[PDB]
Design a protein around this motif. Sequence first.
Motif, mmCIF file in Angstrom:
data_model
loop_
_atom_site.group_PDB
_atom_site.id
_atom_site.type_symbol
_atom_site.label_atom_id
_atom_site.label_comp_id
_atom_site.label_asym_id
_atom_site.label_seq_id
_atom_site.Cartn_x
_atom_site.Cartn_y
_atom_site.Cartn_z
ATOM 1 N N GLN A 1 54.769 -36.724 8.544
ATOM 2 C CA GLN A 1 53.554 -36.519 9.282
ATOM 3 C C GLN A 1 53.740 -36.572 10.783
ATOM 4 O O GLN A 1 54.563 -37.336 11.246
ATOM 5 C CB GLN A 1 52.492 -37.522 8.841
ATOM 6 C CG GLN A 1 51.385 -36.859 8.091
ATOM 7 C CD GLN A 1 50.292 -36.368 8.986
ATOM 8 O OE1 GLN A 1 50.182 -36.794 10.129
ATOM 9 N NE2 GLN A 1 49.451 -35.494 8.467
ATOM 10 N N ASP A 2 52.954 -35.782 11.533
ATOM 11 C CA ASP A 2 52.968 -35.844 12.987
ATOM 12 C C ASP A 2 52.653 -37.252 13.439
ATOM 13 O O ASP A 2 53.181 -37.718 14.455
ATOM 14 C CB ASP A 2 51.944 -34.893 13.634
ATOM 15 C CG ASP A 2 52.212 -33.393 13.346
ATOM 16 O OD1 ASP A 2 53.378 -32.980 13.145
ATOM 17 O OD2 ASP A 2 51.228 -32.618 13.309
ATOM 18 N N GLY A 3 51.780 -37.927 12.678
ATOM 19 C CA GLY A 3 51.148 -39.168 13.124
ATOM 20 C C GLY A 3 50.260 -38.977 14.342
ATOM 21 O O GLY A 3 49.546 -38.018 14.429
ATOM 22 N N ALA A 4 50.299 -39.919 15.278
ATOM 23 C CA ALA A 4 49.483 -39.869 16.499
ATOM 24 C C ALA A 4 50.200 -39.041 17.551
ATOM 25 O O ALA A 4 51.053 -39.531 18.284
ATOM 26 C CB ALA A 4 49.163 -41.307 17.038
ATOM 27 N N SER A 5 49.841 -37.771 17.573
ATOM 28 C CA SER A 5 50.428 -36.778 18.436
ATOM 29 C C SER A 5 49.352 -36.396 19.447
ATOM 30 O O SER A 5 48.518 -37.203 19.784
ATOM 31 C CB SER A 5 50.827 -35.563 17.593
ATOM 32 O OG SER A 5 49.765 -35.194 16.718
ATOM 33 N N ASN A 6 49.379 -35.166 19.926
ATOM 34 C CA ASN A 6 48.505 -34.713 21.008
ATOM 35 C C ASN A 6 47.119 -34.320 20.538
ATOM 36 O O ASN A 6 46.295 -33.905 21.317
ATOM 37 C CB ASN A 6 49.157 -33.513 21.760
ATOM 38 C CG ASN A 6 50.118 -33.957 22.839
ATOM 39 O OD1 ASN A 6 49.717 -34.099 23.986
ATOM 40 N ND2 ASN A 6 51.390 -34.193 22.486
ATOM 41 N N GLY A 7 46.853 -34.386 19.254
ATOM 42 C CA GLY A 7 45.549 -33.926 18.793
ATOM 43 C C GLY A 7 45.620 -33.568 17.346
ATOM 44 O O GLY A 7 46.633 -33.049 16.882
ATOM 45 N N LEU A 8 44.545 -33.879 16.630
ATOM 46 C CA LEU A 8 44.518 -33.729 15.192
ATOM 47 C C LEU A 8 45.218 -32.442 14.707
ATOM 48 O O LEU A 8 46.079 -32.501 13.830
ATOM 49 C CB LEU A 8 43.082 -33.861 14.676
ATOM 50 C CG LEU A 8 42.649 -33.339 13.294
ATOM 51 C CD1 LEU A 8 43.502 -33.856 12.149
ATOM 52 C CD2 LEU A 8 41.177 -33.666 13.056
ATOM 53 N N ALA B 1 42.105 -31.461 3.177
ATOM 54 C CA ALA B 1 43.467 -31.738 3.644
ATOM 55 C C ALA B 1 43.423 -32.611 4.871
ATOM 56 O O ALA B 1 44.386 -33.334 5.151
ATOM 57 C CB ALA B 1 44.228 -30.459 3.942
ATOM 58 N N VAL B 2 42.317 -32.561 5.616
ATOM 59 C CA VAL B 2 42.195 -33.380 6.858
ATOM 60 C C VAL B 2 41.796 -34.808 6.546
ATOM 61 O O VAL B 2 42.091 -35.698 7.325
ATOM 62 C CB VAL B 2 41.250 -32.726 7.938
ATOM 63 C CG1 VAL B 2 41.049 -33.608 9.196
ATOM 64 C CG2 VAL B 2 41.798 -31.358 8.353
ATOM 65 N N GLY C 1 45.114 -36.250 6.501
ATOM 66 C CA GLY C 1 45.627 -36.013 7.829
ATOM 67 C C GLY C 1 45.007 -36.899 8.866
ATOM 68 O O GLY C 1 45.717 -37.553 9.647
ATOM 69 N N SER D 1 46.194 -40.416 8.858
ATOM 70 C CA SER D 1 47.477 -40.500 9.548
ATOM 71 C C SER D 1 47.422 -40.350 11.100
ATOM 72 O O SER D 1 48.012 -41.151 11.831
ATOM 73 C CB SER D 1 48.419 -39.486 8.944
ATOM 74 O OG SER D 1 48.578 -39.826 7.586
ATOM 75 N N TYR D 2 46.708 -39.336 11.587
ATOM 76 C CA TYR D 2 46.651 -39.055 12.994
ATOM 77 C C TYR D 2 46.086 -40.206 13.815
ATOM 78 O O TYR D 2 46.546 -40.551 14.896
ATOM 79 C CB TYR D 2 45.767 -37.850 13.190
ATOM 80 C CG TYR D 2 45.407 -37.648 14.627
ATOM 81 C CD1 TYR D 2 46.294 -36.997 15.495
ATOM 82 C CD2 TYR D 2 44.190 -38.125 15.135
ATOM 83 C CE1 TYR D 2 46.002 -36.837 16.829
ATOM 84 C CE2 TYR D 2 43.877 -37.926 16.480
ATOM 85 C CZ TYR D 2 44.799 -37.279 17.305
ATOM 86 O OH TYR D 2 44.485 -37.077 18.623
ATOM 87 N N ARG E 1 51.655 -48.075 13.519
ATOM 88 C CA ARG E 1 51.967 -46.944 14.398
ATOM 89 C C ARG E 1 53.457 -46.592 14.383
ATOM 90 O O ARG E 1 54.319 -47.443 14.634
ATOM 91 C CB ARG E 1 51.484 -47.183 15.859
ATOM 92 C CG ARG E 1 50.004 -47.545 15.990
ATOM 93 C CD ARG E 1 49.409 -47.377 17.390
ATOM 94 N NE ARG E 1 48.193 -46.573 17.179
ATOM 95 C CZ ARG E 1 48.169 -45.237 17.222
ATOM 96 N NH1 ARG E 1 49.266 -44.552 17.563
ATOM 97 N NH2 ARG E 1 47.041 -44.588 16.958
ATOM 98 N N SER F 1 46.802 -30.367 9.302
ATOM 99 C CA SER F 1 46.430 -31.766 9.024
ATOM 100 C C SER F 1 47.551 -32.739 9.419
ATOM 101 O O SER F 1 47.415 -33.971 9.255
ATOM 102 C CB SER F 1 46.096 -31.951 7.557
ATOM 103 O OG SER F 1 47.273 -32.251 6.839
ATOM 104 N N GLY G 1 48.348 -43.306 13.326
ATOM 105 C CA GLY G 1 49.756 -43.091 13.750
ATOM 106 C C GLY G 1 50.794 -43.111 12.637
ATOM 107 O O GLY G 1 52.007 -43.292 12.908
ATOM 108 N N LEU G 2 50.345 -42.923 11.386
ATOM 109 C CA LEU G 2 51.242 -43.022 10.232
ATOM 110 C C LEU G 2 52.186 -41.819 10.188
ATOM 111 O O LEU G 2 51.874 -40.774 10.779
ATOM 112 C CB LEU G 2 50.445 -43.111 8.941
ATOM 113 C CG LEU G 2 49.288 -44.140 8.929
ATOM 114 C CD1 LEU G 2 48.700 -44.255 7.512
ATOM 115 C CD2 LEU G 2 49.671 -45.550 9.569
ATOM 116 N N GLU G 3 53.366 -41.952 9.577
ATOM 117 C CA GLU G 3 54.292 -40.788 9.607
ATOM 118 C C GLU G 3 54.832 -40.393 8.263
ATOM 119 O O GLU G 3 55.502 -39.380 8.170
ATOM 120 C CB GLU G 3 55.436 -40.950 10.591
ATOM 121 C CG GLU G 3 55.075 -41.755 11.763
ATOM 122 C CD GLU G 3 56.043 -41.630 12.891
ATOM 123 O OE1 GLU G 3 57.270 -41.922 12.695
ATOM 124 O OE2 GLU G 3 55.539 -41.261 13.983
ATOM 125 N N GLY G 4 54.545 -41.164 7.219
ATOM 126 C CA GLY G 4 54.843 -40.676 5.867
ATOM 127 C C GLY G 4 54.028 -39.443 5.474
ATOM 128 O O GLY G 4 53.162 -38.990 6.214
#
Lengths: 873, 869
Positions: free
Chosen positions: B267-274, A148-149, A152, A155-156, A115, B414, A159-162
């Motif tokens: 990347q946003d990473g873990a933000s407020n929503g996909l 693309a998701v 994505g 990552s989301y 994260r 994304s 919690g990845l940021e690369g």
Amino acid sequence: ESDPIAIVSMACRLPGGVNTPQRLWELLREGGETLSGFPTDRGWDLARLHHPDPDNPGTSYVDKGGFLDDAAGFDAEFFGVSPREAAAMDPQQRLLLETSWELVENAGIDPHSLRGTATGVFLGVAKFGYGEDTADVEGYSVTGVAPAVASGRISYTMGLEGPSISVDTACSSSLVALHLAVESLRKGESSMAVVGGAAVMATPGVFVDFSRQRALAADGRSKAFGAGADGFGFSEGVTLVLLERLSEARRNGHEVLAVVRGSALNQDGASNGLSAPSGPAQRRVIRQALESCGLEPGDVDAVEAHGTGTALGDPIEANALLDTYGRDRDADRPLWLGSVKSNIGHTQAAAGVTGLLKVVLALRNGELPATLHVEEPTPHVDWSSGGVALLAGNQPWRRGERTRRAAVSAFGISGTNAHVIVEEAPERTTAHDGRPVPLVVSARSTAALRAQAAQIAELLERPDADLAGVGLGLATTRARHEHRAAVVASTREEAVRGLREIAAGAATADAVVEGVTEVDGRNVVFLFPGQGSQWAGMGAELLSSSPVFAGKIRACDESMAPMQDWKVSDVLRQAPGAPGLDRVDVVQPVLFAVMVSLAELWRSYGVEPAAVVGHSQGEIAAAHVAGALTLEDAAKLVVGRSRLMRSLSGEGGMAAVALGEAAVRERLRPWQDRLSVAAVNGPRSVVVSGEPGALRAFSEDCAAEGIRVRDIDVDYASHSPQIERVREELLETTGDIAPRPARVTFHSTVESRSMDGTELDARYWYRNLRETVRFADAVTRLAESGYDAFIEVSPHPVVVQAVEEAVEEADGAEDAVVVGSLHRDGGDLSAFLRSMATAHVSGVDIRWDVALPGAAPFALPTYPFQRKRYWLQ
Amino acid sequence: ESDPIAIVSMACRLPGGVNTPQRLWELLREGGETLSGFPTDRGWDLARLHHPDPDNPGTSYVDKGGFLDDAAGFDAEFFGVSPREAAAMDPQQRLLLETSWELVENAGIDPHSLRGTATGVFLGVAKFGYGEDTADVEGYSVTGVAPAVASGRISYTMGLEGPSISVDTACSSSLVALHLAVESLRKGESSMAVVGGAAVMATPGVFVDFSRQRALAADGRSKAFGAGADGFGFSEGVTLVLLERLSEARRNGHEVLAVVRGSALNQDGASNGLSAPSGPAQRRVIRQALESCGLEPGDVDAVEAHGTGTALGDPIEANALLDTYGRDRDADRPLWLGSVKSNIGHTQAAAGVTGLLKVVLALRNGELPATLHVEEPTPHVDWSSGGVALLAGNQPWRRGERTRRAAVSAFGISGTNAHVIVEEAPEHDGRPVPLVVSARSTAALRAQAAQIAELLERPDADLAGVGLGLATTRARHEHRAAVVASTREEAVRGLREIAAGAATADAVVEGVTEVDGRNVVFLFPGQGSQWAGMGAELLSSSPVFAGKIRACDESMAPMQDWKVSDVLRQAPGAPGLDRVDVVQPVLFAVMVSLAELWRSYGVEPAAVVGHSQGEIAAAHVAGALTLEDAAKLVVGRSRLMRSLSGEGGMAAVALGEAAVRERLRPWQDRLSVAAVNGPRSVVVSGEPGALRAFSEDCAAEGIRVRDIDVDYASHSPQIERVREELLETTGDIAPRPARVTFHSTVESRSMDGTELDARYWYRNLRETVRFADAVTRLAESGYDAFIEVSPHPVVVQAVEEAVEEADGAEDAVVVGSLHRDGGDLSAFLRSMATAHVSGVDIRWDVALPGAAPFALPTYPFQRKRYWLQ
Ligand SMILES: [Cl-]
Ligand SMILES: [Cl-]
């Protein structure tokens, strides 16, 4: 060399039950195959799908192929994803969430620890028509099938940021991804990378389309470089590897499976058709791969080819190997050639990285598996002339003098080519038994926790390898989830015995603790109680099993030596000549040492208090732990004070009354030889203090009326006027103590607020001694202002109940933990570990690796997903 | 920082006819929009598609969007595509083929010069459902929609050999594409890279989709950073730039438009929503951009925002800017902010590169264009105090003081983000001009001529520039035409004439060739081609010519009195062309000089052939003889024929050889058959009495013999009588191995230079010129182009004749070099034109020294409808 990239972990979902790199090695090694009939459970109109005549529109001439066993199953609560969204999600995404979690778990890293890091994602993916047909205010249905998701969403969720990129270069998609990730890594733009491809066929589209072209093998077998090469056989795959620069794996201590030495990409431009391979183009990517790392062809032991089994493309591929690798040659070291597609078909976007899996698996299992369907090699190549040799059987490929290297090639129909060079990793029971080991498991649901306990149950009884490794692996290596359980055990039968109890939902059992939490950490308050919690056992076992605890006990004896002639270790030991715990002036110092030493032990495992609070003389310990008092000043205080109490023996007395402060206060009005209200600990727990004759008369006085008063074993009335007469000896014996700034919030039970450590004067300690201790109010105000975890640092929990009461009635605290640390028939290391478990399970984090020095992490099984069918009509 | 990556070229297809970068600039300058109704040519059920309540399944509440003018139109023949494969090609793939073609041409590169190069291709594309239910043994309907084939097809048809990668990062795909390209350039894996994206909506799907979430601007206007930001407004675009490293672009002389300084992805990473934007993530991506190129925030002038016009995304975006670029800033030079999408909508995969195009055009024109729909800036941002200032109106942004830099940001749904830093680039004739045009069909040649004629009216024009660029900058295709002009007015006349679809002025030539290359034969005739004034205008002009003429004038100097230079200019009291001893050396010298002219222009002979005395210029040109030796010869045998005058004669007979022989038996005082030039073309030579009688028996059977303006009888028996002095006068010659094939017409076989002895030169003079069956033999061993190197064309139709009666050429070309009253350089150019226009290649740049190439229009594609139903 430059900074070479390591493969640090792997994970797959392949046809036939192969949901583990281990299960793929078993497939490669038995030389087996996973073709099967078309899937019965995806909605396909199977009756109408098959027709032997290629030219027949809308149908397939093949009914065999490689398919995942349950492509529709998905744990959605696990990934914070709702039933509707899940329904709308392509299987490709769903399997990637699962696979990528497996993959990190597999590399021996707690997923949660990525994260916020520059971890990046590089995937090969394409649509197969999962969206299409049957028509979401959240737009789950565009976001659920978008390639693309697929990146994505990994990552989301994690919690990845690369960078997260999805790539479509067709049947080289995943090798292209690998190539991009190395650069990202090569240049510090990503710190780790997740790399791969997913391909799960929603419809039989690819079968119909390629039947039109007569491009499919009749068998469905991909006969690579065999005489029967017939066409493609298509399969599904979701394969992943985890990449990190070698330098960074070392420094973090991640096991290195293998090493990406170099790689190349190119395009074969003006071939004989948009469709067709190009041999010059292949020769060139191969050569550019070798040069990009400083290798000559001779340095490569084996190639895991693209090998689709296409009548036209195999010869082209092989000749290109014969023109590069096969040119120089020992007629006794040929280049070994095979292909995974013979075992498991052509996995499209997952094709090239699946090439890697085999390669890395051959590396680490010391051999090269056979390729299949090669009884006779294709006649369109000169084989036994020049040095490229199909792997008709499995060959040893063992760590020796000569470095092991092999290459993966992948070549898509759009004409973009890859060729990656892989190298073996550089070369590589440190004490154990006796001693308590915490086993903590967690999972995001009740069913998942039960499962998670059961697979660890069955690991431990595999006598293979054991206790503290599983302990360390569980602590530093899995995420900590909402549902938690813990076993403290010092013997493996003990441990499985209690994992079983957990698995079985049958809850209790002595050294088994269960709990549930939504915070993953809390605001911790250490509470130091007054006298009352003492037992003759106290710190004995601890002194002999814990260097940190004996640490402080020894420091305290050192600080207290000029003030007395007996020593705490000796009383804790009950040595001949030990003063005994009867005299307040022995008790109060001993307790100080114990309480203060436990506080230390707690900090060992990373529990730092955000605040302390203390009951009566307990504030001295509190004060030393926030660090408002040196050890010598703390001792000076605790000893000065109690030596006086011992002079006052017989002069006064104390009692607990089962009544509220105000009622007690109306009751005490006829007196003043006993204005107690010494302490207020809760609504039905108030201490009263004063001259014996007024106490006896007041206490008896409500045996009538049946109000409970219990007498406290004490020879003096503290927190009362009968204290006023030692004030001068006290301020004298103890002036110019030097209080300092508090590292930790000190909430006073006397002053009823946070107190700068600088106000903790000799006069303050007099006030402590002289005034009512406002214990319930303190705890209550702390719970009002956010503090969350209340931990009693004593030999026996005397104030837990009082704490549960004050928290309970305070705005917003039905989510708080109260825990003691040691008990009477249970002080010792495992008791303490049990308290920490109890605190852990309701949210307080402990660094368990402290209970396991020397231990090395055991490799563990992955998360027990609790899957449900998602799929649209 | 040091050698970053130049953008050298630009190409686009955007809505509203915006099909050229400069049209894109027209639009940003006037602050125009491209909103339009949903297209009526795509098969959408318009009547049922549109409906105002968002909740209603299947529909959109929006009826406006940004769409291309001819999404379905493609020139398939041009690209080698079959009308079947074409219908089956995603419009996204077809436009990418066209715009990538234009992109290279916009660069000043012949797109054929990139075949077999390491050019790489990096694109953002995604499937919009083109084929997904119309309902094919070729695989056209699979390969036609594959996202991977949109890049791959560019590489296949242009012979490009670097990586070609399709990339889907959603709204940041182009900028990711860019980043990857830059890396591959920086590490030498590609030499050049095509970068951009494509988005064409085949189905109304996105509109139905983002209606159901109320994500769509009611209006359809993307009000970026505006008070009334409402949601997305979707559009189609196809957009490309051509990258390459500064140093390479300087090597090849490619014009550098701008520079990609720095670049980062996260990347946003873990933000407020996909699908939700992250401020912290926007901050970090900006700061990684800056830090990876050695810049600081204060070093940037403007930001081209992701600016989608979403109520929730813009403030987040603007506060990120306001938190990095503005924070410290000078009150005085604040960060200018705008978004192209105010102008043209969210073009999707292409959005990033299109922002990038904006930025560069802004660099080239010295200004930052206004952003739209900002009458009132949104109040959820704090423009109040500090760094960020919306481009409310156009602002000057000129070269000078501080280096000009701007950033383009792009943020996909994304969560993958992109920030890229773009920096400014670093620091006639009177004479004839050749204009070559070519195309893949005749309709297309007429169009290209047409469009170049238009170019040439624009006041300004520049003939030699356009010439230089047509010649060095454009593929040479199959259908070809050429105008040789000295003025604008006359060039236009010529092109217009080619575009009219009929007729020649002398200045204009057309041809069709399937080769782009020929095996050339140089032919060197004898006496006959002489005309007074021959070399002249050419001496004064063309120094290559004058130099060899001068070189001949030295060679011959010890051997005679008069300068060959003097005979062409007709110097007072100069020799004149009435006697062999002048005529021969002068023709030797002219032919030899003309051969050096052709070679000037890169036409090197693969063999030479000679007629009688023309074998001497042949042998020099081939390298067998030095200029000195060859002069000794030409002068040597000319001088012996002035001393044979009135002794014999010569005459062409219009009859075949065999029968001429059958008529020559009673007069062996003419072992004439001096020459055999074709099937009704034979030359007779001998004693004038004998010749008169044979002619009079000829005339009187109606066989035509004319007499030749000559007073000697070469190739006759009378020549045995002079062999003597010839050898005395002419030994000491040293033949020398020849670089170029010498097919002898004396012996009929390729010869080996060193056989070209004094004694061979005697046979030349004595034996019969087997000219026809020399040319026929060359023609049959695959030689292909016959250039008569003479000042008037004297064997051209004899050579034509000989070529038609030879298996092989339906298709040879024969051209001469000058003509009687067409000496002069422009005559020579239209000669090369004629040859060029049939596949002989010519280094035309040679005709335009010091010119500068002029930007041209791109290929005029001849498009048909292709769409699935
Ligand atoms: Cl080669
Ligand atoms: Cl920050």
